[PDB]
Amino acid sequence: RNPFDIDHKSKYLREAALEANLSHPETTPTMLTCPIDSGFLKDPVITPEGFVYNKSSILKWLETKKEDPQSRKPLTAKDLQPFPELLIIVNRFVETQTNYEKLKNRLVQNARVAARQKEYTEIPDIFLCPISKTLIKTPVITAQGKVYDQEALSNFLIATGNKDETGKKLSIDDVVVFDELYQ
Amino acid sequence: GMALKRIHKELNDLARDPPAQCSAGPVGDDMFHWQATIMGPNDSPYQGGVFFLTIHFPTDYPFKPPKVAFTTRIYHPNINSNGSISLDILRSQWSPALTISKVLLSICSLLCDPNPDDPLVPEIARIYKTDREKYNRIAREWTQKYAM
């Protein structure tokens, strides 16, 4: 097969998988979403140039212009190849989102149990910061589900150059505010 | 859905990655009626001037372009006294892949580099092509007068 000919499907999938693996579960990854309807790719079709859209969305556009919405190059309905493979990566991600939503609920609910205890000699760990060992003043949550203090961590990441225990690259934009833990 | 669906998505994108010389968002509920803020580019006569924009999304967004106009008075060959902006992507060259954030960037660079051969104020266009010093002088003074 000709090397100068590009298979965009295997290329797209590979890059989409990476993006999904690197993506915070609160964030919906770009190339799992339709450029036109902004939602999850649910009936994905792919163009000869390699662009992916939900079928209903790209066809709706083709009623107006017969060009690709990203390249402005000629595009018609017969150039739209079915790309059902991508759905495997989409479902893989919504699974991550679901699991991530379980993690928050578990943290919240035993933080509610811990809060109703009186006369502890030790503050419950659900309320303590792992790298501050004090009361979490401003609750903040990782993508895996560990809870820090927004600035006990911010100063920590600044100190060691966006790294943390466990030795892993973390940024304070990889982290979402999580007031619901005390709520 | 689909318009409302996308508008909400575009709003949330500007909650993490707000445009550097821009600032958008809705006036209030309604969500189809936004108001944005762009800054005057450096080395342009609009430097150090905050300009206000009104944004109306059509019902069949994003298959039709948003209606965008300057609320702030500005001196420019592609912007008239009413705020109407002469820009191809707000018209026939609109694409459903474009976002409001990209529209603002286009508008921003239009301020930096006008298109006099596409005049909406033919008199300012003339001055811009036969006398830049005059053009720059005036636009800079309008900026002082009307831009925040």
Number of Cα atoms under 13 Å in the Cβ half of residue A98? 6
**Which of A38, A57, A61 lies at the smallest CB-CB distance from B9?**
A38
Q: Which amino acid is at A93?
A: F
From CA A153, how far away is CA A162, in angstroms rounded?
A: 10
Q: How many CB atoms lie within 10 A of CB A15?
A: 11
Domain ranges in chain B are: 1-148
List of chain A residues whose C-beta atoms are within 8 Å of the C-beta of residue B5: 37-39
DSSP state, B66? Answer: P
Is A173 in contact with B16 (Cβ distance < 8 A)?
yes
Distance, in Å, from the CA atom of B115 to the CA atom of B87, rounded to the nearest integer, reads 9
CA distance B54 to B100: 12
Which residues on chain B are in Cβ contact (under 8 Å) with A36?
62, 96-97
Contacts of B61 in chain A (CB under 8 A): none
Could you report how far apart the first and last alpha carbons of chain B are, in Å?
Answer: 36
Distance in Å, alpha carbon of B13 to nearest chain A alpha carbon? 10
Of the candidate CATH numbers 3.10.110.10, 3.40.50.300, 1.20.1250.20, 3.40.50.10070, the domain formed by B1-148 belongs to: 3.10.110.10
**CATH among 3.40.30.10, 3.30.40.10, 1.10.357.10, 3.40.50.2300 for A113-183:** 3.30.40.10
Answer yes or no: do B95 and A72 touch at CB < 8 A: yes
Side-chain-side CA neighbours of A15 within 13 Å: the count stands at: 11
Report CA torsion sign: A79, B94, B104, B25. negative
**Chain B interface, mutation test: which of A36, A56, A58, A172, most B Cβ atoms within 10 Å?**
A36
Contacts of A61 in chain B (CB under 8 A): 63, 96
Residues 6+ apart with CB under 8 A from A86: A12, A13, A16, A32, A41, A44, A52
Superfamily of domain A1-112: Zinc/RING finger domain, C3HC4 (zinc finger) (3.30.40.10)
Determination technique for this PDB entry?
X-ray
- Residue of B63, B98, B101 for testing the chain A interface, max A β-carbons within 10 Å: B63
Residue of B5, B9, B97 with shortest CB distance to A69: B97
Chain A window 79-138: which residues touch B at a Cβ cutoff of 8 Å? Answer: none
**Residues B67/B83, Cβ–Cβ less than 8 Å:** no
Q: Please name the member of A39, A61, A173 whose beta carbon is closest to the beta carbon of B96.
A: A61
Please give the span between the terminal C-alpha atoms of chain A, in angstroms, as a whole number.
Answer: 60
Domain boundaries, chain A: 1-112, 113-183
Instruction: Report the SS3 class of residue B122.
Output: helix
Q: How far is B55 from chain A (nearest CA, A)?
A: 19
Q: How far apart are CA A174 and CA A172, in angstroms?
A: 5
Contact B10/B22 with Cβ under 8 angstroms?
Answer: no
* Residue in A116, A179, A106, A93 with CA at minimum distance from that of residue A145: A106
Q: Does B6 touch chain A (CB under 8 A)?
A: yes
Please indicate if any CB of chain A lies within 8 Å of the CB of B2.
Answer: yes
